Each structure stands twice: as structure tokens, then as C-alpha cells.
Amino acid sequence: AFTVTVPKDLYVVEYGSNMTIECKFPVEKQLDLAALIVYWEMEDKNIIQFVHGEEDLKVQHSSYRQRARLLKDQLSLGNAALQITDVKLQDAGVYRCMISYGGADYKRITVKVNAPY
Amino acid sequence: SEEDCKVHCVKEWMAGKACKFDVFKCLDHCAAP
Ligand SMILES: *[C@@H]1O[C@H](CO)[C@@H](O)[C@H](O)[C@H]1NC(C)=O
Ligand code: NA
């Protein structure tokens, strides 16, 4: 069965830092971009829509502009890594990663934003 | 059969993107007994 797995289901991240949240999917030999969809979402805000290799900045939610990207080097290894720079208090919440690659699946990841002192 | 239900959720999510379909609810229901 096609399964998406998360190495971590909880990330505790510092306010103003950078986070990379990971979502793994099975890759046999080389990645085929023509068969791959990656969708990152957070409480109905669309962060990444990677459709068969194609990304459209116009449909990224305004709260993630210039802060969120899908790391392409990880993608080759079956790792859909979402990097968010300059983490905001509003970035706290439940992220969903949906991967379609042959089959389809999704996982939830909780992000908590701390302000250490 | 479950695999096929999930592929179809993605199909309908894509169709929507052309034309508010909740793909996570759809995928959930494929796994739901
Ligand atoms: C986050 O990324 C930027 C470059 O994109 C880097 O300059 C910065 O040091 C990183 N932030 C932290 C707190 O590590
Ligand atoms: Na810290």
C-alpha cells in the first residue's frame, strides 16, 4: 500500500527561527516528476501545490509568501520537506502533507512555536 | 479497493482546481470502515 510517513509528528520551533517539516513517501530508483503531486496545507491555507513538477506562486496563501518552499534536493530521496523561514507565532498549528505518487495518502504534523527566555 | 478510492480523491481534488472539495475528508472516508 502507498503510505506517507512523518519522522516527527510534533515540532517545537523558536519564534523567528527556520523550520523544515518532513513528509516521506516510497521512491524506487529515480523520482518521476510526471507522476508526483505534493500538497502542503495549514488550517485551510494552501502553502505548496506541486503538481507533476509545476508550482504556481499565485496560489500560495499570502501569510507564507517569501517564507515557504518545498526543498527540491530532499524530493529526489522521497522526502517532501517544507522549509518555513522567519517562523511566526501564527505558524503554530496542524500542517497536512498529501502525497500522490502511484497511490495517495496524507499525514498531520503539529507545530508549536516557543519564545525561549 | 482502498488504494483506488484514494487515487480518485486526488482525481476529484485536481478536477476542482480546474473548475470547495475537501481531499483530506475524502481520503479519511476511503480508510473509514
Ligand atoms: C534562516 O535562513 C536564513 C537564510 O534564508 C539565514 O540567514 C538565517 O540565519 C536562518 N535563521 C536562523 C535563526 O538560523
Ligand atoms: Na530555541
For every residue of A10-27, DSSP letters joined together read EEEEETTS-EEE--B---
Residue ID of nearest Cα to ligand 1 atom 5: A85
Would the CB atoms of A103 and B24 count as touching at under 8 Å? no
**Cβ proximity of A86 and B7 under 8 Å:** no
Q: In degrees to the nearest 10, what's the CA dihedral of A29, A83, A9, A52?
A: -40
A18 C-beta closer than 6 A to ligand 1: yes
Domain map (residue ranges) of chain A:
1-117
**What three-state secondary structure class fits A65?**
coil
Quick one: resolution in A?
2.0
Method: X-ray
Rounded-to-integer distance, Cα A102 and Cα A94, Å = 26
Q: Closest ligand to A13 CA? A: 2
CB contact under 8 A, A104 and B6: yes
